[PDB]
């Protein structure tokens, strides 16, 4: 009499991932059977590749989740709005599929199974292949993940809903960034460090009263009466060396509120100041999704 989390939320240190974002082309009923088939396929792939430490998540946009749930639960869910009056684009789609493991080849086979399950019921808008770079650094050269929640216990506390109809579920936020590494390389290392709020090589936090309020850490390390607004990030670098490249941002939270407060801060809506990382990288997509618990995917029908 309890709820099970979808396998792709809590895995830490996974080296590769695949994110598929898509729109629903026909009746929403096609998603019910397809989602059951896909979670069945994920269990089959986990049994076939135990050393991959494979996990996956199927999550839904506001319009299709309100239809599938009958308007019950997911009280915070809404279409991703535009932040900073345009600085952050909105590209809200209906379905998000997040696959992560220690083996990219296994993720590829799982992605093909997801596409076969949903079939022509969906219109794929985006497919991004994430990879962990050297020393878990973002392509800018700064380590990404240091203050991210560590261990299954704290990650569950931050990302997984505790009780009620949505017990075992989570809110998802995805946003693809395009880095301009030529513009980053024009900045001196000390100026890049003041932009992030941590040192580049050693990955040491620069004190809050020593760094600009526009620094990344000053924008996203938010507290409400001393209580941190934490999120579980699963972001990874992506792209080609000669073409488009950057960071595919992905975060899970039991409360959509924590993610929104950080976006309001980063894009100038809270105090009129914006994130200093906008000097070299920009967001080009944006969407909010609800990841139900495993058994609520089984009760779709
Ligand atoms: C280009 C896009 C982004 C890059 C390169 C990036 C990079 C980084 C880096 C280098 C860190 C510091 C190390 C760490 O603790 O993980 C960091 C921390 C963090 N980032 Fe970002 N980030 C990006 C976007 C975002 C977005 C969109 C959000 C949230 C909406 C976010 C939320 C956070 C949070 C919560 C932390 C930890 C802050 C703390 O408590 O110290 N980031 N990120
Ligand atoms: Mg802190």
mmCIF file of C-alpha atoms and ligand atoms in Angstrom:
data_model
loop_
_atom_site.group_PDB
_atom_site.id
_atom_site.type_symbol
_atom_site.label_atom_id
_atom_site.label_comp_id
_atom_site.label_asym_id
_atom_site.label_seq_id
_atom_site.Cartn_x
_atom_site.Cartn_y
_atom_site.Cartn_z
ATOM 1 C CA UNK A 1 0.000 0.000 0.000
ATOM 2 C CA UNK A 2 2.671 2.502 -0.910
ATOM 3 C CA UNK A 3 4.379 4.166 -3.914
ATOM 4 C CA UNK A 4 7.490 3.298 -5.952
ATOM 5 C CA UNK A 5 9.666 6.033 -7.584
ATOM 6 C CA UNK A 6 10.502 5.839 -11.337
ATOM 7 C CA UNK A 7 14.053 4.405 -11.687
ATOM 8 C CA UNK A 8 15.664 7.465 -13.394
ATOM 9 C CA UNK A 9 15.215 10.162 -10.688
ATOM 10 C CA UNK A 10 17.597 9.134 -7.872
ATOM 11 C CA UNK A 11 20.880 7.341 -9.897
ATOM 12 C CA UNK A 12 23.935 9.512 -9.054
ATOM 13 C CA UNK A 13 27.115 9.879 -11.176
ATOM 14 C CA UNK A 14 25.586 8.331 -14.372
ATOM 15 C CA UNK A 15 28.064 8.893 -17.313
ATOM 16 C CA UNK A 16 25.438 9.142 -20.111
ATOM 17 C CA UNK A 17 21.817 10.056 -20.761
ATOM 18 C CA UNK A 18 19.181 10.500 -23.476
ATOM 19 C CA UNK A 19 16.344 13.060 -23.244
ATOM 20 C CA UNK A 20 13.450 12.898 -25.739
ATOM 21 C CA UNK A 21 10.857 15.727 -25.761
ATOM 22 C CA UNK A 22 7.702 15.253 -27.857
ATOM 23 C CA UNK A 23 4.173 16.460 -28.645
ATOM 24 C CA UNK A 24 1.051 14.269 -28.672
ATOM 25 C CA UNK A 25 -0.338 13.942 -32.210
ATOM 26 C CA UNK A 26 -3.573 12.020 -31.607
ATOM 27 C CA UNK A 27 -5.986 11.041 -28.807
ATOM 28 C CA UNK A 28 -4.284 11.111 -25.337
ATOM 29 C CA UNK A 29 -5.387 7.382 -24.788
ATOM 30 C CA UNK A 30 -2.349 6.300 -26.906
ATOM 31 C CA UNK A 31 -0.048 7.485 -24.001
ATOM 32 C CA UNK A 32 -1.660 5.088 -21.401
ATOM 33 C CA UNK A 33 -0.661 1.755 -23.061
ATOM 34 C CA UNK A 34 2.625 3.153 -24.463
ATOM 35 C CA UNK A 35 3.793 4.285 -20.979
ATOM 36 C CA UNK A 36 3.001 0.782 -19.537
ATOM 37 C CA UNK A 37 4.929 -0.899 -22.362
ATOM 38 C CA UNK A 38 7.942 1.430 -21.850
ATOM 39 C CA UNK A 39 8.273 0.935 -18.065
ATOM 40 C CA UNK A 40 7.999 -2.843 -18.814
ATOM 41 C CA UNK A 41 10.867 -2.448 -21.353
ATOM 42 C CA UNK A 42 13.013 -0.535 -18.784
ATOM 43 C CA UNK A 43 12.625 -3.479 -16.314
ATOM 44 C CA UNK A 44 13.606 -5.924 -19.138
ATOM 45 C CA UNK A 45 16.732 -3.837 -20.001
ATOM 46 C CA UNK A 46 17.684 -3.616 -16.267
ATOM 47 C CA UNK A 47 17.504 -7.465 -16.063
ATOM 48 C CA UNK A 48 19.559 -7.863 -19.308
ATOM 49 C CA UNK A 49 22.203 -5.149 -18.366
ATOM 50 C CA UNK A 50 22.529 -5.160 -14.524
ATOM 51 C CA UNK A 51 26.011 -3.516 -14.654
ATOM 52 C CA UNK A 52 24.581 -0.509 -16.636
ATOM 53 C CA UNK A 53 22.723 0.722 -13.506
ATOM 54 C CA UNK A 54 19.962 1.849 -15.887
ATOM 55 C CA UNK A 55 17.163 4.209 -14.884
ATOM 56 C CA UNK A 56 14.382 5.978 -16.796
ATOM 57 C CA UNK A 57 11.541 8.475 -16.325
ATOM 58 C CA UNK A 58 8.366 9.156 -18.351
ATOM 59 C CA UNK A 59 6.884 12.601 -17.492
ATOM 60 C CA UNK A 60 3.917 14.576 -18.813
ATOM 61 C CA UNK A 61 3.124 18.201 -19.656
ATOM 62 C CA UNK A 62 0.261 20.090 -17.983
ATOM 63 C CA UNK A 63 -2.483 19.650 -20.633
ATOM 64 C CA UNK A 64 -1.990 15.878 -21.124
ATOM 65 C CA UNK A 65 -1.398 15.199 -17.356
ATOM 66 C CA UNK A 66 -4.682 16.984 -16.405
ATOM 67 C CA UNK A 67 -6.493 14.664 -18.903
ATOM 68 C CA UNK A 68 -4.703 11.441 -17.785
ATOM 69 C CA UNK A 69 -5.174 12.233 -14.029
ATOM 70 C CA UNK A 70 -8.721 13.651 -14.356
ATOM 71 C CA UNK A 71 -7.599 16.906 -12.704
ATOM 72 C CA UNK A 72 -6.564 15.166 -9.434
ATOM 73 C CA UNK A 73 -3.225 16.066 -7.804
ATOM 74 C CA UNK A 74 -0.160 17.764 -9.363
ATOM 75 C CA UNK A 75 -1.462 21.094 -7.948
ATOM 76 C CA UNK A 76 1.633 23.087 -8.962
ATOM 77 C CA UNK A 77 1.823 21.740 -12.536
ATOM 78 C CA UNK A 78 1.447 24.370 -15.278
ATOM 79 C CA UNK A 79 2.839 25.129 -18.760
ATOM 80 C CA UNK A 80 6.404 26.499 -18.532
ATOM 81 C CA UNK A 81 6.029 30.304 -18.698
ATOM 82 C CA UNK A 82 8.561 32.674 -20.180
ATOM 83 C CA UNK A 83 10.933 34.173 -17.533
ATOM 84 C CA UNK A 84 12.621 37.568 -17.736
ATOM 85 C CA UNK A 85 9.927 38.579 -20.279
ATOM 86 C CA UNK A 86 11.852 36.510 -22.936
ATOM 87 C CA UNK A 87 15.359 35.907 -21.604
ATOM 88 C CA UNK A 88 14.300 32.250 -20.855
ATOM 89 C CA UNK A 89 12.175 30.913 -24.216
ATOM 90 C CA UNK A 90 9.325 28.559 -23.441
ATOM 91 C CA UNK A 91 8.961 25.338 -25.521
ATOM 92 C CA UNK A 92 6.411 23.373 -23.480
ATOM 93 C CA UNK A 93 5.807 19.913 -24.981
ATOM 94 C CA UNK A 94 3.516 17.018 -23.887
ATOM 95 C CA UNK A 95 5.929 14.155 -23.152
ATOM 96 C CA UNK A 96 9.436 13.895 -21.665
ATOM 97 C CA UNK A 97 11.465 10.642 -21.675
ATOM 98 C CA UNK A 98 14.697 10.738 -19.598
ATOM 99 C CA UNK A 99 17.029 7.687 -19.804
ATOM 100 C CA UNK A 100 20.338 7.503 -17.827
ATOM 101 C CA UNK A 101 22.952 4.734 -17.156
ATOM 102 C CA UNK A 102 26.697 3.953 -17.106
ATOM 103 C CA UNK A 103 26.457 2.778 -20.778
ATOM 104 C CA UNK A 104 25.400 5.028 -23.713
ATOM 105 C CA UNK A 105 24.842 1.919 -25.961
ATOM 106 C CA UNK A 106 22.199 0.598 -23.501
ATOM 107 C CA UNK A 107 20.512 4.075 -23.356
ATOM 108 C CA UNK A 108 20.325 4.012 -27.196
ATOM 109 C CA UNK A 109 18.520 0.612 -27.173
ATOM 110 C CA UNK A 110 16.125 1.930 -24.449
ATOM 111 C CA UNK A 111 15.472 5.117 -26.519
ATOM 112 C CA UNK A 112 14.579 2.906 -29.543
ATOM 113 C CA UNK A 113 12.173 0.893 -27.286
ATOM 114 C CA UNK A 114 10.535 4.184 -26.102
ATOM 115 C CA UNK A 115 10.039 5.250 -29.760
ATOM 116 C CA UNK A 116 8.556 1.804 -30.660
ATOM 117 C CA UNK A 117 6.154 1.916 -27.636
ATOM 118 C CA UNK A 118 4.735 5.420 -28.331
ATOM 119 C CA UNK A 119 5.108 5.085 -32.152
ATOM 120 C CA UNK A 120 3.268 7.545 -34.396
ATOM 121 C CA UNK A 121 1.189 8.889 -31.428
ATOM 122 C CA UNK A 122 4.058 11.355 -30.738
ATOM 123 C CA UNK A 123 6.039 14.043 -32.705
ATOM 124 C CA UNK A 124 9.677 14.115 -31.458
ATOM 125 C CA UNK A 125 10.759 17.788 -31.092
ATOM 126 C CA UNK A 126 14.103 17.187 -29.394
ATOM 127 C CA UNK A 127 16.524 14.280 -28.787
ATOM 128 C CA UNK A 128 19.712 15.133 -26.824
ATOM 129 C CA UNK A 129 22.564 12.729 -25.970
ATOM 130 C CA UNK A 130 24.193 13.780 -22.707
ATOM 131 C CA UNK A 131 27.707 12.721 -21.677
ATOM 132 C CA UNK A 132 29.710 13.324 -18.471
ATOM 133 C CA UNK A 133 32.872 15.330 -19.399
ATOM 134 C CA UNK A 134 36.390 15.114 -17.764
ATOM 135 C CA UNK A 135 36.282 15.626 -13.924
ATOM 136 C CA UNK A 136 32.431 16.046 -14.161
ATOM 137 C CA UNK A 137 33.008 19.566 -15.557
ATOM 138 C CA UNK A 138 30.578 21.608 -17.618
ATOM 139 C CA UNK A 139 32.059 22.458 -21.112
ATOM 140 C CA UNK A 140 32.947 25.919 -19.637
ATOM 141 C CA UNK A 141 35.614 24.110 -17.502
ATOM 142 C CA UNK A 142 33.773 24.522 -14.151
ATOM 143 C CA UNK A 143 32.827 21.419 -12.108
ATOM 144 C CA UNK A 144 28.992 20.854 -12.247
ATOM 145 C CA UNK A 145 27.339 18.948 -9.310
ATOM 146 C CA UNK A 146 29.335 19.717 -6.080
ATOM 147 C CA UNK A 147 26.371 21.069 -3.985
ATOM 148 C CA UNK A 148 23.835 18.771 -5.728
ATOM 149 C CA UNK A 149 21.963 16.544 -2.921
ATOM 150 C CA UNK A 150 24.161 13.476 -2.147
ATOM 151 C CA UNK A 151 22.910 9.937 -1.231
ATOM 152 C CA UNK A 152 19.537 8.215 -1.761
ATOM 153 C CA UNK A 153 18.047 9.520 1.563
ATOM 154 C CA UNK A 154 18.630 13.274 0.922
ATOM 155 C CA UNK A 155 17.841 12.925 -2.824
ATOM 156 C CA UNK A 156 14.436 11.324 -1.892
ATOM 157 C CA UNK A 157 13.755 14.145 0.643
ATOM 158 C CA UNK A 158 14.411 16.816 -2.046
ATOM 159 C CA UNK A 159 12.968 15.165 -5.232
ATOM 160 C CA UNK A 160 10.200 12.690 -4.221
ATOM 161 C CA UNK A 161 6.653 13.712 -3.082
ATOM 162 C CA UNK A 162 5.992 12.157 0.376
ATOM 163 C CA UNK A 163 2.229 11.480 0.697
ATOM 164 C CA UNK A 164 -1.210 11.911 -0.884
ATOM 165 C CA UNK A 165 -2.224 10.764 -4.394
ATOM 166 C CA UNK A 166 1.117 11.886 -5.949
ATOM 167 C CA UNK A 167 3.261 10.024 -3.299
ATOM 168 C CA UNK A 168 6.402 8.759 -5.180
ATOM 169 C CA UNK A 169 6.089 11.345 -7.976
ATOM 170 C CA UNK A 170 8.193 14.402 -8.843
ATOM 171 C CA UNK A 171 8.210 17.620 -10.872
ATOM 172 C CA UNK A 172 10.723 17.867 -13.756
ATOM 173 C CA UNK A 173 12.259 20.918 -15.425
ATOM 174 C CA UNK A 174 14.308 20.658 -18.664
ATOM 175 C CA UNK A 175 16.165 23.510 -20.435
ATOM 176 C CA UNK A 176 18.840 23.170 -23.181
ATOM 177 C CA UNK A 177 21.648 25.799 -23.062
ATOM 178 C CA UNK A 178 23.905 26.725 -26.043
ATOM 179 C CA UNK A 179 27.404 27.761 -24.901
ATOM 180 C CA UNK A 180 29.502 30.280 -26.845
ATOM 181 C CA UNK A 181 32.965 29.054 -25.734
ATOM 182 C CA UNK A 182 34.697 31.726 -27.919
ATOM 183 C CA UNK A 183 32.961 34.460 -25.826
ATOM 184 C CA UNK A 184 33.845 32.588 -22.574
ATOM 185 C CA UNK A 185 37.551 32.323 -23.600
ATOM 186 C CA UNK A 186 37.695 36.164 -24.071
ATOM 187 C CA UNK A 187 37.010 36.471 -20.275
ATOM 188 C CA UNK A 188 39.959 36.207 -17.850
ATOM 189 C CA UNK A 189 39.854 33.209 -15.419
ATOM 190 C CA UNK A 190 39.225 35.562 -12.395
ATOM 191 C CA UNK A 191 36.251 37.196 -14.264
ATOM 192 C CA UNK A 192 34.823 33.719 -15.112
ATOM 193 C CA UNK A 193 35.185 32.735 -11.405
ATOM 194 C CA UNK A 194 33.213 35.868 -10.299
ATOM 195 C CA UNK A 195 30.562 34.949 -12.937
ATOM 196 C CA UNK A 196 30.085 31.410 -11.452
ATOM 197 C CA UNK A 197 30.853 32.066 -7.757
ATOM 198 C CA UNK A 198 33.435 29.230 -7.418
ATOM 199 C CA UNK A 199 37.150 28.974 -8.410
ATOM 200 C CA UNK A 200 37.787 27.238 -11.769
ATOM 201 C CA UNK A 201 40.633 24.724 -11.200
ATOM 202 C CA UNK A 202 40.202 23.928 -7.460
ATOM 203 C CA UNK A 203 36.335 24.295 -7.445
ATOM 204 C CA UNK A 204 36.333 26.334 -4.116
ATOM 205 C CA UNK A 205 33.275 28.428 -3.250
ATOM 206 C CA UNK A 206 33.951 32.220 -3.312
ATOM 207 C CA UNK A 207 32.317 33.803 -0.195
ATOM 208 C CA UNK A 208 28.833 35.263 -0.742
ATOM 209 C CA UNK A 209 29.926 38.771 0.398
ATOM 210 C CA UNK A 210 33.070 38.615 -1.914
ATOM 211 C CA UNK A 211 31.278 37.724 -5.176
ATOM 212 C CA UNK A 212 28.786 39.797 -7.268
ATOM 213 C CA UNK A 213 25.034 39.332 -6.609
ATOM 214 C CA UNK A 214 24.759 38.407 -10.365
ATOM 215 C CA UNK A 215 27.141 35.385 -9.844
ATOM 216 C CA UNK A 216 25.468 32.011 -10.599
ATOM 217 C CA UNK A 217 25.681 30.816 -6.958
ATOM 218 C CA UNK A 218 24.192 34.125 -5.679
ATOM 219 C CA UNK A 219 21.269 33.644 -8.152
ATOM 220 C CA UNK A 220 20.473 29.938 -7.356
ATOM 221 C CA UNK A 221 21.687 29.252 -3.739
ATOM 222 C CA UNK A 222 18.410 30.554 -2.234
ATOM 223 C CA UNK A 223 17.180 30.224 1.367
ATOM 224 C CA UNK A 224 13.742 30.985 2.980
ATOM 225 C CA UNK A 225 14.344 31.683 6.756
ATOM 226 C CA UNK A 226 17.617 29.648 6.588
ATOM 227 C CA UNK A 227 15.995 26.666 4.794
ATOM 228 C CA UNK A 228 17.629 26.000 1.346
ATOM 229 C CA UNK A 229 15.421 25.650 -1.764
ATOM 230 C CA UNK A 230 17.121 22.427 -2.926
ATOM 231 C CA UNK A 231 16.686 20.524 -6.237
ATOM 232 C CA UNK A 232 18.147 17.255 -7.661
ATOM 233 C CA UNK A 233 20.007 18.159 -10.870
ATOM 234 C CA UNK A 234 20.743 15.470 -13.559
ATOM 235 C CA UNK A 235 22.224 17.914 -16.182
ATOM 236 C CA UNK A 236 24.971 16.855 -18.583
ATOM 237 C CA UNK A 237 27.128 18.380 -21.330
ATOM 238 C CA UNK A 238 26.046 17.631 -24.964
ATOM 239 C CA UNK A 239 26.872 18.431 -28.609
ATOM 240 C CA UNK A 240 29.729 18.400 -31.130
ATOM 241 C CA UNK A 241 33.084 20.247 -30.872
ATOM 242 C CA UNK A 242 32.620 22.110 -34.191
ATOM 243 C CA UNK A 243 28.752 22.593 -33.986
ATOM 244 C CA UNK A 244 26.192 23.410 -31.282
ATOM 245 C CA UNK A 245 27.210 22.447 -27.723
ATOM 246 C CA UNK A 246 26.469 23.329 -24.114
ATOM 247 C CA UNK A 247 24.574 21.934 -21.089
ATOM 248 C CA UNK A 248 21.252 20.098 -21.149
ATOM 249 C CA UNK A 249 19.824 21.333 -17.806
ATOM 250 C CA UNK A 250 17.537 18.819 -15.993
ATOM 251 C CA UNK A 251 16.202 19.053 -12.418
ATOM 252 C CA UNK A 252 13.755 17.073 -10.212
ATOM 253 C CA UNK A 253 12.009 18.447 -7.116
ATOM 254 C CA UNK A 254 9.057 17.396 -4.844
ATOM 255 C CA UNK A 255 7.978 21.044 -5.170
ATOM 256 C CA UNK A 256 7.923 22.936 -8.506
ATOM 257 C CA UNK A 257 8.231 26.121 -6.319
ATOM 258 C CA UNK A 258 11.983 25.568 -5.580
ATOM 259 C CA UNK A 259 12.813 25.427 -9.313
ATOM 260 C CA UNK A 260 10.621 28.477 -10.179
ATOM 261 C CA UNK A 261 12.198 30.677 -7.412
ATOM 262 C CA UNK A 262 15.654 29.936 -8.907
ATOM 263 C CA UNK A 263 14.438 30.825 -12.459
ATOM 264 C CA UNK A 264 12.763 34.065 -11.262
ATOM 265 C CA UNK A 265 16.112 34.979 -9.655
ATOM 266 C CA UNK A 266 18.354 33.979 -12.641
ATOM 267 C CA UNK A 267 16.250 35.802 -15.277
ATOM 268 C CA UNK A 268 15.659 39.180 -13.506
ATOM 269 C CA UNK A 269 12.058 38.802 -12.253
ATOM 270 C CA UNK A 270 12.885 38.891 -8.493
ATOM 271 C CA UNK A 271 15.309 41.883 -8.127
ATOM 272 C CA UNK A 272 15.931 43.124 -11.711
ATOM 273 C CA UNK A 273 19.449 41.550 -11.839
ATOM 274 C CA UNK A 274 20.176 38.508 -14.064
ATOM 275 C CA UNK A 275 22.608 35.598 -14.058
ATOM 276 C CA UNK A 276 26.178 36.474 -15.168
ATOM 277 C CA UNK A 277 26.383 33.161 -17.180
ATOM 278 C CA UNK A 278 24.176 34.929 -19.789
ATOM 279 C CA UNK A 279 27.441 36.683 -20.925
ATOM 280 C CA UNK A 280 28.527 33.374 -22.684
ATOM 281 C CA UNK A 281 25.529 30.902 -22.757
ATOM 282 C CA UNK A 282 21.769 31.135 -23.456
ATOM 283 C CA UNK A 283 18.733 28.878 -22.852
ATOM 284 C CA UNK A 284 16.880 27.889 -26.127
ATOM 285 C CA UNK A 285 14.170 25.439 -24.817
ATOM 286 C CA UNK A 286 12.091 25.227 -21.595
ATOM 287 C CA UNK A 287 9.443 22.899 -20.163
ATOM 288 C CA UNK A 288 7.852 21.640 -16.917
ATOM 289 C CA UNK A 289 6.665 18.009 -16.572
ATOM 290 C CA UNK A 290 5.144 15.761 -13.871
ATOM 291 C CA UNK A 291 6.806 12.348 -13.354
ATOM 292 C CA UNK A 292 4.182 10.049 -11.714
ATOM 293 C CA UNK A 293 5.098 7.116 -9.425
ATOM 294 C CA UNK A 294 5.636 3.658 -11.018
ATOM 295 C CA UNK A 295 2.351 2.197 -9.899
ATOM 296 C CA UNK A 296 0.390 5.271 -11.158
ATOM 297 C CA UNK A 297 1.832 4.462 -14.601
ATOM 298 C CA UNK A 298 0.347 0.885 -14.126
ATOM 299 C CA UNK A 299 -3.048 2.375 -13.158
ATOM 300 C CA UNK A 300 -3.214 4.208 -16.534
ATOM 301 C CA UNK A 301 -5.909 2.447 -18.543
HETATM 302 C C1 LIG B 1 24.435 26.911 -18.496
HETATM 303 C C2 LIG B 1 23.682 26.479 -17.537
HETATM 304 C C3 LIG B 1 24.195 26.155 -16.227
HETATM 305 C C4 LIG B 1 25.479 25.890 -15.857
HETATM 306 C C5 LIG B 1 26.756 25.832 -16.645
HETATM 307 C C6 LIG B 1 25.403 25.680 -14.458
HETATM 308 C C7 LIG B 1 26.572 25.437 -13.750
HETATM 309 C C8 LIG B 1 26.703 25.310 -12.413
HETATM 310 C C9 LIG B 1 27.936 25.204 -11.667
HETATM 311 C C10 LIG B 1 29.324 25.253 -12.177
HETATM 312 C C11 LIG B 1 27.594 25.054 -10.370
HETATM 313 C C12 LIG B 1 28.504 24.988 -9.176
HETATM 314 C C13 LIG B 1 28.886 23.612 -8.643
HETATM 315 C C14 LIG B 1 27.693 22.989 -7.970
HETATM 316 O O1 LIG B 1 27.420 23.084 -6.812
HETATM 317 O O2 LIG B 1 27.009 22.183 -8.616
HETATM 318 C C15 LIG B 1 26.152 25.141 -10.339
HETATM 319 C C16 LIG B 1 25.379 25.048 -9.204
HETATM 320 C C17 LIG B 1 23.991 25.122 -9.142
HETATM 321 N N1 LIG B 1 23.184 25.363 -10.143
HETATM 322 FE FE1 LIG B 1 23.691 25.714 -11.986
HETATM 323 N N2 LIG B 1 24.218 25.832 -14.045
HETATM 324 C C18 LIG B 1 23.406 26.090 -14.974
HETATM 325 C C19 LIG B 1 22.064 26.278 -14.906
HETATM 326 C C20 LIG B 1 21.258 26.204 -13.825
HETATM 327 C C21 LIG B 1 19.822 26.387 -13.790
HETATM 328 C C22 LIG B 1 18.930 26.746 -14.916
HETATM 329 C C23 LIG B 1 19.481 26.208 -12.487
HETATM 330 C C24 LIG B 1 18.201 26.224 -11.778
HETATM 331 C C25 LIG B 1 17.096 26.612 -12.232
HETATM 332 C C26 LIG B 1 20.711 25.843 -11.775
HETATM 333 C C27 LIG B 1 20.809 25.562 -10.439
HETATM 334 C C28 LIG B 1 21.935 25.344 -9.676
HETATM 335 C C29 LIG B 1 21.929 25.062 -8.188
HETATM 336 C C30 LIG B 1 20.778 24.942 -7.264
HETATM 337 C C31 LIG B 1 23.241 24.927 -7.864
HETATM 338 C C32 LIG B 1 23.867 24.679 -6.518
HETATM 339 C C33 LIG B 1 24.038 25.997 -5.752
HETATM 340 C C34 LIG B 1 24.558 25.855 -4.297
HETATM 341 O O3 LIG B 1 23.784 25.550 -3.444
HETATM 342 O O4 LIG B 1 25.726 26.009 -4.066
HETATM 343 N N3 LIG B 1 21.668 25.928 -12.609
HETATM 344 N N4 LIG B 1 25.704 25.234 -11.565
HETATM 345 MG MG1 LIG B 2 25.579 27.013 -0.163
#
